[PDB]
């Protein structure tokens, strides 16, 4: 059965001298210079994703999906990554299944993570963005796969900016607006039909938990 997964939001820097100040010249190269294409694919439009923070964002999701690997020893563990621009910050929602991570193990693991990406991320500068790197809450909230149509993948340009999978049901959606559309109104009649199930239903303790 498909598990559960955490989500880890992570702020992106999108500022060189208010978010990364003092960072090496070949971090400012690398990030003025990269050059992003959308794949044949896609159904976006580039002009709107914003390239720079997007080039720390894919090195961030990188290093997080590795060290995670490592720390939950799930090596093909699944995952969903959504890059978004948010009102204040550009951001990162990181769905990780739980498998190989004990909830009370959680934070004392994104802790050695976290110290990774600043050591080889950032180059030991602390990034100067407010509660960067915070793991969602209720103790560590769980959530289950519809977490992703229900919430991520109904974003739309700009406030979508990228997207990362191993999830085979959601890799031609990561970066097509009408797949997106199509598995939320997949979902959500999926969602409506259980409903009206529920309601239906003449059977034995048919008492809500
Ligand atoms: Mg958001």
């Known amino acids: 059965h498909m598990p559960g997964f955490y989500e880890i939001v992570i702020k992106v820097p999108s500022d060189l001298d208010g978010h990364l100040p003092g960072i090496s010249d070949s971090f400012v190269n690398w990030v003025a210079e990269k ?22 964002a894919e090195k961030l999701q990188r290093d997080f999906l590795t060290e995670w690997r490592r720390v939950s020893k799930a090596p093909e563990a699944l995952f969903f990554v ?20 004990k909830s009370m193990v959680l934070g004392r693991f994104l802790s050695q993570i976290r110290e990774k990406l600043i050591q080889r991320i950032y180059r030991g500068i ?11 809450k209720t103790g560590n909230k769980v959530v289950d796969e519809s977490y992703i149509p229900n919430y991520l993948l109904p974003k739309t340009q700009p406030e979508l900016q990228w997207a990362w999978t191993n999830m085979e049901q959601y890799l031609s959606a990561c970066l097509n607006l ?5 598995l939320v109104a997949q979902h959500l009649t999926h969602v409506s039909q259980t409903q009206e199930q529920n309601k239906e239903n003449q059977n034995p303790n048919s008492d809500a938990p």
């Open 35 to 56: 050059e992003w294409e959308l794949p044949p694919d896609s159904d976006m439009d580039l002009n709107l994703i914003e390239q720079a923070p997007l080039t720390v």
């Open 82 to 101: 959504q890059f978004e621009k948010g009102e204040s910050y550009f951001h990162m929602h990181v769905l990780v299944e739980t498998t190989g991570v």
């Open 126 to 136: 602390e990034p100067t963005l407010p509660n960067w790197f915070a793991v969602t």
């Open 178 to 182: 009408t797949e997106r559309k199509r």
